[PDB]
Amino acid sequence: MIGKRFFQTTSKKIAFAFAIDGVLFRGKKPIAGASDALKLLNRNKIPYILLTNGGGFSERARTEFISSKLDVDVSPLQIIQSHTPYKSLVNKYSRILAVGTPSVRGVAEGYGFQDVVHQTDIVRYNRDIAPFSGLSDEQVMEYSRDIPDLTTKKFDAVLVFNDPHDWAADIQIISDAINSENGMLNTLRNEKSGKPSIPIYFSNQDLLWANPYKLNRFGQGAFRLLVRRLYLELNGEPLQDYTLGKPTKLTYDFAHHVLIDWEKRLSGKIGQSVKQKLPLLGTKPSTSPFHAVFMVGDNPASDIIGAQNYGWNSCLVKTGVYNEGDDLKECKPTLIVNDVFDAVTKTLEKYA
């Protein structure tokens, strides 16, 4: 690094994986320096991915939005959102309750799930299932659909894609499913268990996240704690669930595959028109071309501990969840810096 320019010093490959909320954006507004940071990497063909516990729309839709806001080209191949690894569950669960904002229905169908039911479809079917739903009539008409065989075909899993926006209904409906008789709507099992009636996946355990507001807000990790609390109260055993998203090894392994394939494309070893193969859930990449990968994040409990457990390096920024002075617990970030631009420039200068 020299002033604003980068200068390759070695053939050793360094890569970055960026969180988005609290690192590149707050809400829909870019963080100062975020555009400059990715422009520098693009200019010098340094591989990076966006590894975010956010979600709600398709990978293409989200990267097109980011590209336009940051004035830089980000490929849909560069992003892993919280629910992206759900692509690998499509052959496992025929009918899913896809929980999230109403846009997750389209995301789930796009991934290939055979029979997607959104939680608003159950409110639509019978308002009295969710007595504390806030949905107005206009919202029910926009969000929900009549579903064939809603009450005669079992649900096979609950997949939480992102945070839904009507939690008294969302929590009631999830609880109904995981305490049902073998996943049939309108049923309740006789026997208590730590094992839910059908499996339930959460894609993000972030208790807190940084949106436009000056104070950290609860995220899906908080939602998960709430579902779990009521499950325990009804069963007397903690809920056996599945978790994906940072800091899980499941998500880091998936992300690592994506990064490896991206670098092959970036370096011209693979054509821009070659379809990308979905990584197998639970598998470590065969190779790893990177001398180091730096996770750039704002949340010690997600980004930093996730990178650390995985064996990646990490930059902790101060533009999101973390404020200087906060207890890092067992986190030892490789660098702590003000913002994403400083993260990239200081990492390249030190480690490249």
Ligand X SMILES: O=P(O)(O)OC[C@@H](O)CO
Report the interface residues with Mg ion, using CB under 5 A. 19, 21-22, 134, 298, 320
Which residue lies nearer to ligand X by CB, 206 or 263? 206
Which residue lies nearer to its own copies by CB, 168 or 280? 168
CA-to-CA separations, 76 to 13, 36, 44, 325, in angstroms, rounded:
22, 20, 19, 36
Residue 325 tokens read as 């002075």
Considering the complex, what minimum distance in angstroms separates the CB of residue 231 from its own copies?
Answer: 11
Q: Which residues bind ligand X (CB under 6 A)?
A: 19-22, 52-54, 204, 206, 209, 219
Considering the complex, what minimum distance in angstroms separates the CB of residue 56 from ligand X?
Answer: 9
Which residue lies nearer to ligand X by CB, 170 or 206? 206
* Inter-residue contact 52 to 20 (CB < 8 Å): yes
Q: Which residue is nearest to ligand X (CB)?
A: 52
CB-based burial of residue 139 (10 Å sphere; 0-12 exposed, 13-18 middle, 19+ buried)? Answer: middle
Of these partners, ligand X, its own copies, Mg ion, none, which one is at the site of residue 61 (CB under 5 to 8 Å by kind)? none
Of these partners, ligand X, its own copies, Mg ion, none, which one is at the site of residue 249 (CB under 5 to 8 Å by kind)? none
The H or E element that residue 348 is part of is helix 340-351
Of these partners, ligand X, its own copies, Mg ion, none, which one is at the site of residue 59 (CB under 5 to 8 Å by kind)? none
* Inter-residue contact 159 to 83 (CB < 8 Å): yes
Q: What is the dihedral of CA 276, 281, 282, 286, to 10 degrees?
A: -10
Of these partners, ligand X, its own copies, Mg ion, none, which one is at the site of residue 54 (CB under 5 to 8 Å by kind)? ligand X
Considering the complex, what minimum distance in angstroms separates the CB of residue 142 from its own copies?
Answer: 9
Chain position carrying tokens 């055993």: 237
Considering the complex, what minimum distance in angstroms separates the CB of residue 154 from Mg ion?
Answer: 29
Residue 89 tokens read as 């569950």
Which residue lies nearer to ligand X by CB, 54 or 333? 54
DSSP secondary structure code for residue 44 in this structure? T
For residue 219, count other CB atoms closer than 10 A to its CB: 25
